[PDB]
Amino acid sequence: ADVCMDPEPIVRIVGRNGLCVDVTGEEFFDGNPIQLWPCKSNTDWNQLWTLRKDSTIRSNGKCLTISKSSPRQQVVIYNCSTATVGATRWQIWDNRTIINPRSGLVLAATSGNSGTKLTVQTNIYAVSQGWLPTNNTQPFVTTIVGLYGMCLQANSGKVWLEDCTSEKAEQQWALYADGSIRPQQNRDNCLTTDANIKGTVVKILSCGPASSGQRWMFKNDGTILNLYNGLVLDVRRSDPSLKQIIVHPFHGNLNQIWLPLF
């Protein structure tokens, strides 16, 4: 068995509102807090992280670390050997969760505003805790096709299934690195499920909360899952005439099957 390789890629890290994991004011002094800063297009190192094969997410030799500072749960840059090893080790998940195994806490950004300092919180798969290690800092725009090859459409806070139309901006969806699904028409809004129980009809609500019912995960089985409650998107009664998409236990039927046709 000839093992694979750990390429230790150098990527940015996009999160909430699609801002980047940034080392504040480019200061690299042990303890300088890591924040969320609009993504850079140049090559500044304070926004470039190397995923070395030791589970550290170094940016200029300095480790993404959890500060043992006073209130705590703060995330800051810190000498990789100086720091408590455990506070520099992380795991980037496919679920789009960056978690510090040692604590079991996950990288989070309690605000969508720029400058918001990173903190590590308990995993509740909220948007605010979802990240993506990509040098591609734009939202993946696409249409989301479901049943009968129909498209997910948004009008105001409502989202139903309509027949796909080339123009139609209502059928354009921006898939943010944070795990949110936002209507191109208004990237301030989110594909939201204001409840974690079956039959809950999905709406288009403000992303401000960056709640768990706003983060989504496109699974390998064609379903769009909500990590938190475990339900999947579902065109109720496999009837797009009901103009209602809901969350429902995963069964796998085509009414729960989606495809980001880009």
């Binding site: 694979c4 390429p7 890629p9 990527v11 496919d94 993506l132 591609n136 496109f218 880009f262």
Partner: protein, 259 residues
Amino acid sequence: KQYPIINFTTADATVESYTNFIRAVRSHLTTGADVRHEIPVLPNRVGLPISQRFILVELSNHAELSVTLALDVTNAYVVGCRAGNSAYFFHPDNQEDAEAITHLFTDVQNSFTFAFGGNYDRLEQLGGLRENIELGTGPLEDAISALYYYSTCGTQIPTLARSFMVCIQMISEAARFQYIEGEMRTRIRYNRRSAPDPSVITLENSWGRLSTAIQESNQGAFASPIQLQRRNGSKFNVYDVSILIPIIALMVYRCAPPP
């Protein structure tokens, strides 16, 4: 001593019959149970017992015809096809496979193999660009007929080529990518036959690169970008697997996972 057969017919086929077909195909190419980044990995060629090296797809159509394409569990590709009492194979790219394909349709006397291989490069030379070959229940229906009557001078090579590519895309590349399967579903859905668009072709073309990028990721992070294209031709980069989890469904074994 008989490989497994997944069945499918274009006769009053539905998005459900098709969906079940493709899942059944994947089901038989993945028994191995080796997933990575939520994406299943095809059995490793190297050291794979001939006994479990192939699976058969029996294809029937409105004209009550049936051909059986042979697929390599190793890469979900069609290696050969058997049309009734005839059986032809593509020209293998190595002594290794060349030996294997000779385990396929053995009781068939008129079994032989062409001088050309089954890769698109060749098949497109013989029959034309994928970007010009219509896909949908319609083509597959006819592709099946052609394949059936090739042994009886019913089918021209350029046509045999095309007949193959549509089956390969509609089957192998659909099994590989849920995006392609998805794309087929829509066609079947509306009885609207059409040619593969940039996004589809580029995907088929990147299957090998993707299988690799992904398996050699650090944590879903790519060492280097894989370029793809939107239906409108425009290309984009992908440095992360997350975006692909819902696109690709099968990957060719490229290396052993680190223990």
